[PDB]
Amino acid sequence: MKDRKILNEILSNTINELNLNDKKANIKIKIKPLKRKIASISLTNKTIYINKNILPYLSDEEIRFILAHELLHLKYGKYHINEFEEELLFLFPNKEAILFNLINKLFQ
Protein backbone atom coordinates (compact mmCIF):
# COMPACT_ATOMS: atom_id res chain seq x y z
CA MET A 1 0.00 0.00 0.00
CA LYS A 2 1.00 3.70 -0.33
CA ASP A 3 2.76 5.21 2.76
CA ARG A 4 -0.06 6.80 4.81
CA LYS A 5 2.40 9.10 6.61
CA ILE A 6 3.00 11.39 3.60
CA LEU A 7 -0.76 11.40 2.71
CA ASN A 8 -1.72 12.33 6.32
CA GLU A 9 0.83 15.17 6.38
CA ILE A 10 -0.05 16.56 2.89
CA LEU A 11 -3.77 16.46 3.73
CA SER A 12 -3.32 18.26 7.10
CA ASN A 13 -0.83 20.84 5.69
CA THR A 14 -2.96 21.61 2.61
CA ILE A 15 -6.21 21.95 4.60
CA ASN A 16 -4.34 24.42 6.89
CA GLU A 17 -2.89 26.61 4.09
CA LEU A 18 -6.26 26.61 2.22
CA ASN A 19 -8.03 27.74 5.50
CA LEU A 20 -10.27 24.61 5.49
CA ASN A 21 -9.60 23.58 9.16
CA ASP A 22 -13.38 24.08 9.91
CA LYS A 23 -13.85 20.93 7.72
CA LYS A 24 -10.94 18.85 9.24
CA ALA A 25 -13.47 16.57 11.09
CA ASN A 26 -15.11 15.79 7.70
CA ILE A 27 -12.37 15.67 5.05
CA LYS A 28 -10.80 12.23 4.50
CA ILE A 29 -8.82 10.54 1.74
CA LYS A 30 -10.07 7.15 0.46
CA ILE A 31 -8.07 5.03 -2.00
CA LYS A 32 -10.22 2.98 -4.38
CA PRO A 33 -10.40 2.09 -8.12
CA LEU A 34 -11.93 4.95 -10.13
CA LYS A 35 -13.47 4.28 -13.56
CA ARG A 36 -12.59 7.46 -15.50
CA LYS A 37 -10.68 9.71 -13.03
CA ILE A 38 -7.30 10.02 -11.22
CA ALA A 39 -9.15 11.58 -8.27
CA SER A 40 -12.63 12.81 -7.35
CA ILE A 41 -14.67 14.20 -4.47
CA SER A 42 -17.94 13.42 -2.76
CA LEU A 43 -19.09 16.98 -1.95
CA THR A 44 -21.79 15.50 0.37
CA ASN A 45 -19.45 13.82 2.93
CA LYS A 46 -16.17 15.75 1.94
CA THR A 47 -14.31 12.55 0.93
CA ILE A 48 -11.40 12.81 -1.53
CA TYR A 49 -11.03 9.66 -3.61
CA ILE A 50 -7.63 8.80 -5.12
CA ASN A 51 -7.53 6.23 -7.90
CA LYS A 52 -5.80 3.12 -6.42
CA ASN A 53 -4.36 2.29 -9.92
CA ILE A 54 -2.80 5.88 -10.40
CA LEU A 55 -1.30 6.40 -6.99
CA PRO A 56 1.91 4.22 -7.49
CA TYR A 57 2.90 6.32 -10.59
CA LEU A 58 2.65 9.75 -8.90
CA SER A 59 5.66 11.66 -7.54
CA ASP A 60 5.36 13.27 -4.05
CA GLU A 61 4.95 16.71 -5.70
CA GLU A 62 2.17 15.33 -7.99
CA ILE A 63 0.33 13.88 -4.94
CA ARG A 64 0.61 17.32 -3.21
CA PHE A 65 -0.75 18.96 -6.42
CA ILE A 66 -3.67 16.50 -6.92
CA LEU A 67 -4.75 16.77 -3.25
CA ALA A 68 -4.61 20.62 -3.42
CA HIS A 69 -6.66 20.48 -6.67
CA GLU A 70 -9.41 18.33 -5.05
CA LEU A 71 -9.41 20.44 -1.84
CA LEU A 72 -9.89 23.55 -4.03
CA HIS A 73 -12.94 21.88 -5.66
CA LEU A 74 -14.23 21.21 -2.04
CA LYS A 75 -13.58 24.90 -1.22
CA TYR A 76 -14.83 26.62 -4.44
CA GLY A 77 -17.11 24.21 -6.32
CA LYS A 78 -17.12 22.63 -9.78
CA TYR A 79 -15.24 25.36 -11.73
CA HIS A 80 -11.70 26.81 -11.90
CA ILE A 81 -12.75 30.41 -11.08
CA ASN A 82 -9.97 33.05 -10.71
CA GLU A 83 -9.76 32.63 -6.84
CA PHE A 84 -9.34 28.83 -7.29
CA GLU A 85 -6.63 29.28 -9.95
CA GLU A 86 -4.80 31.99 -7.86
CA GLU A 87 -4.69 29.69 -4.78
CA LEU A 88 -3.54 26.70 -6.84
CA LEU A 89 -0.75 28.81 -8.41
CA PHE A 90 0.22 30.05 -4.92
CA LEU A 91 0.57 26.47 -3.68
CA PHE A 92 2.23 25.35 -6.96
CA PRO A 93 4.01 28.19 -8.84
CA ASN A 94 5.09 25.60 -11.47
CA LYS A 95 1.54 24.18 -11.94
CA GLU A 96 1.50 24.66 -15.76
CA ALA A 97 4.66 22.51 -16.23
CA ILE A 98 3.27 20.01 -13.63
CA LEU A 99 0.02 19.66 -15.67
CA PHE A 100 1.74 19.23 -19.06
CA ASN A 101 4.19 16.76 -17.51
CA LEU A 102 1.30 14.74 -15.93
CA ILE A 103 -0.73 14.07 -19.11
CA ASN A 104 2.49 12.95 -20.93
CA LYS A 105 3.45 10.60 -17.92
CA LEU A 106 0.01 8.95 -17.47
CA PHE A 107 -1.41 8.18 -20.95
CA GLN A 108 -2.06 4.38 -21.11
Of residues 5 and 36, the one with the C-beta less far from a second copy: 36
- 81 part of the interface to Zn ion, by CB under 5 A: no
- Positive or negative, the CA dihedral 29, 71, 53, 58 is negative
- If one asks whether residue 103 binds a second copy (CB under 8 A), the answer comes out as yes
Residue 36 lies near a second copy (rule: CB under 8 A): yes
Beta pairing partners, 32: 51
Which of residues 90 and 100 has its CB atom nearest to Zn ion in the complex?
100
Choose among 81, 80, 92: nearest CA to 17. 92
The strand ranges marked E within the chain are: 28-32, 39-42, 47-51
Q: Tell the smallest beta-carbon distance from residue 84 to Zn ion (Å).
A: 8
Q: Which of 26, 37, 59, 100 binds Zn ion (CB under 5 A)?
A: 100
82 binds a second copy (CB under 8 A): no
19 near a second copy, judged by CB under 8 A: no
SS3 label, residue 25: coil
Q: Which amino acid is at 102?
A: L
**Can you give the binding site for Zn ion, defined by CB under 5 A?**
100
